[PDB]
């Protein structure tokens, strides 16, 4: 990672998600980068849960988020929850008003906007401290949307959105943590600035900066270093789980860390991806294939190998001279775990998809010809297979085959049979289903269920 600017004394960073649900890949990037810089600079990392929008809080997320961070391997030093800090935001609203940096605006929003867009001040902007403080206190008994606190910025700012932006609003809704205790809530740019300052954040790594600068200015605070990186290319998902067509936060159709973990994607793969992309200023474009590539490099060195025949067809090897005992390593680089032994006696299951007529070599076993729907023995050796132009195919002895299924990344179910040794696997094991893909065992027999990672 590139060096941080203006480092003086201890470095303090934060990761600040909203509790709208568990973490997704986008979150992982901010979490990893901030964690990596805290490690690099021997500094601290603050987890700040930004739950100041009562209608957008998922109660389960408070526990899910730190669990997801642990999964990623992120360590941190303090956990702060914004809904525990309401009186702090109120305190600093009063201070900001006393310093002449904010006012309570009771204008109709559209009438205010018309003035604002022409660089003209509303009457509220001219009120004094005690006048504003009285209006502020009144907000606590007013209706949703009836008054706001606005930060005094520049009414002639080139960017209209930065012109006297809103720091506090009234919302009449039950918060899942604090219930109906509060109706006056901070807007993100206010609570973020106040918390970054009070918690001692030195470097912010993730319009907004420009807005917050006015707050720091008015309060007499030095802002943190701001470092912004390019885009890489939750509420909709939560709705889906509630309605249907998502089984949960770990449904493979979702980009949550939970869903990808369930498929056997390693957190190390995610960390490596985010680190190598770094704090690149320019927009980057990662594909899932990029993540799969990193994961494959990890799994291919250790994942145990088995034959799973999807949509199997049961076929007699007609003319087999006699039984053939086949040995094949569980992993060619790890002799310690030994070899599978497959007993070819008469019938086999072959994967049925795109199974056309012609010569085949059942891996490590025998060469056959499939035609007219019949599988006929040809020979046994590798040279004969080359002479035939036989295509390699995985296979399962019929006598000892086990039922299995694999849930694919679109949540579709692929049914088939797997070789007997697969019964040794336990939930969480991640294996290579040869010539099919890597997959994590999600539930054990009878009837093993795997979740597909990638080819």
In the complex, minimum distance from the CB of residue 208 to Zn ion, in angstroms, rounded to a whole number? 23
Selected binder of Zn ion within 107, 270, 360, 368 (CB under 5 A): 107
User: For residues 117 and 119, what is the distance between their CA atoms, to the nearest angstrom?
Assistant: 6
Q: Of the listed pieces 30-38, 116-124, 341-349, 421-429, which binds Zn ion according to CB under 5 A? A: 116-124
Residues 206-225 touching Zn ion, rule: CB under 5 A, are none
Residue 124 interacts with Zn ion (CB under 5 A): yes or no: yes
Selected binder of Zn ion within 122, 147, 414, 441 (CB under 5 A): 122
Handedness of CA 344, 394, 301, 67 (dihedral sign): negative
Q: Of the listed pieces 90-98, 118-126, 140-148, 179-187, which binds Zn ion according to CB under 5 A? A: 118-126
* Residue nearer to Zn ion on the CB measure, 81 or 127: 127
User: For residues 319 and 378, what is the distance between their CA atoms, to the nearest angstrom?
Assistant: 8
Selected binder of Zn ion within 65, 86, 96, 105 (CB under 5 A): 105
In the complex, minimum distance from the CB of residue 162 to Zn ion, in angstroms, rounded to a whole number? 17
Contacts of 373 (CB under 8 A, 6+ apart): none
In the complex, minimum distance from the CB of residue 112 to Zn ion, in angstroms, rounded to a whole number? 5
Nearest to 171 by CA among 208, 134, 140, 193: 140
Q: Of the listed pieces 40-48, 123-131, 152-160, 234-242, which binds Zn ion according to CB under 5 A? A: 123-131
Helix axis angle, 208-219 relative to 86-98, nearest 10°?
70
Q: Of the listed pieces 122-130, 247-255, 259-267, 364-372, which binds Zn ion according to CB under 5 A? A: 122-130
Residues 247-276 touching Zn ion, rule: CB under 5 A, are none
User: For residues 420 and 340, what is the distance between their CA atoms, to the nearest angstrom?
Assistant: 9
* Residue nearer to Zn ion on the CB measure, 110 or 383: 110
In the complex, minimum distance from the CB of residue 275 to Zn ion, in angstroms, rounded to a whole number? 48
User: For residues 121 and 123, what is the distance between their CA atoms, to the nearest angstrom?
Assistant: 7
In the complex, minimum distance from the CB of residue 141 to Zn ion, in angstroms, rounded to a whole number? 19
Residue 380 Cα distances to 316, 376, 386, 387, angstroms: 16, 12, 11, 12
In the complex, minimum distance from the CB of residue 104 to Zn ion, in angstroms, rounded to a whole number? 8
Residue 46 interacts with Zn ion (CB under 5 A): yes or no: no
* Residue nearer to Zn ion on the CB measure, 105 or 330: 105
3-state secondary structure 59-111: CCHHHHHHHHHHHHCCCCCEEEEHHHCHHHHHHHHHHHHHCCCEEEECCCHHH
With contacts defined by CB under 5 A, how many residues of the chain interact with Zn ion? 4
* Residue nearer to Zn ion on the CB measure, 165 or 308: 165
In the complex, minimum distance from the CB of residue 297 to Zn ion, in angstroms, rounded to a whole number? 59
Residue 147 interacts with Zn ion (CB under 5 A): yes or no: no
With contact defined as beta carbons under 8 Å apart, do 184 and 170 qualify? yes
* Residue nearer to Zn ion on the CB measure, 122 or 257: 122
Tokens of 89: 């935001």
With contact defined as beta carbons under 8 Å apart, do 358 and 369 qualify? yes
- Which 8-state DSSP code applies to residue 162? G
Q: Which residues contact Zn ion (rule: CB under 5 A)?
A: 105, 107, 122, 124
């Amino acid at each position: 990672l590139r060096e941080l600017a203006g480092v003086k004394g201890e470095v303090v960073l934060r990761f600040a998600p909203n509790p709208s649900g568990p973490l997704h890949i986008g979150h992982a990037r901010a979490a990893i980068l901030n964690h990596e810089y805290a490690r690099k600079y021997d500094g601290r990392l603050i987890l700040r849960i930004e739950d100041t929008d009562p209608r957008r809080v998922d109660p389960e997320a408070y526990d899910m988020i730190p669990a997801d961070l642990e999964w990623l391997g992120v360590e941190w030093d303090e956990t702060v929850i914004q809904s525990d800090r309401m009186e702090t935001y109120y305190e600093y609203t009063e201070k900001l008003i006393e310093r002449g940096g904010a006012y309570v605006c009771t204008c109709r929003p559209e009438e205010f906007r018309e003035l604002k867009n022409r660089g003209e001040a509303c009457h509220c902007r001219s009120l004094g401290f005690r006048e504003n403080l009285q209006r502020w206190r009144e907000m606590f008994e007013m209706k949703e949307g009836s008054a706001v606190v606005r930060v005094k910025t520049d009414l002639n700012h080139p960017n209209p959105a930065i012109r006297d932006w809103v720091s506090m609003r009234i919302v009449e809704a039950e918060h899942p943590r604090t219930g109906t205790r509060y109706r006056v809530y901070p807007m993100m740019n206010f609570s973020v600035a106040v918390d970054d300052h009070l918690l001692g954040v030195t470097h912010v790594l993730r319009a907004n900066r420009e807005k917050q600068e006015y707050l720091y200015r008015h309060l007499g605070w030095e802002p943190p270093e701001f470092i912004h990186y390019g885009r890489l290319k939750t509420s909709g998902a939560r709705e889906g789980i509630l309605r249907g067509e998502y089984s949960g936060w770990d449904d493979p159709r979702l980009g949550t860390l939970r869903a990808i973990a369930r498929r056997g994607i390693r957190p190390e793969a995610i960390r490596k991806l985010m680190v190598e992309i770094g704090v690149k200023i320019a927009d980057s474009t990662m594909s899932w294939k990029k993540i799969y590539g990193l994961n494959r490099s990890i799994l291919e060195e250790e994942a145990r190998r088995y034959f799973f025949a999807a949509d199997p067809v049961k076929l007699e090897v007609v003319g087999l001279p006699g039984p053939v005992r086949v040995e094949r390593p569980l992993h060619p680089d790890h002799p310690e775990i030994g070899n599978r032994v497959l007993e070819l006696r008469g019938e086999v299951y072959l994967p049925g998809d795109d199974l056309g007529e012609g010569p085949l070599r059942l891996i490590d076993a025998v060469n056959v010809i499939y035609s007219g729907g019949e599988l006929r023995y040809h020979s046994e050796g590798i040279e004969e297979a080359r002479e035939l132009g036989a295509s390699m195919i995985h296979w399962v002895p019929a006598e000892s085959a086990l039922e299995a299924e694999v849930i694919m990344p679109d949540a579709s179910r692929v049914r088939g049979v797997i070789e007997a040794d697969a019964s040794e696997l336990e939930v969480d094991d991640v294996v290579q289903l040869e010539r099919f893909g890597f997959a994590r065992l999600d539930s054990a027999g009878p009837g093993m269920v795997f979740y597909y990672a990638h080819k």
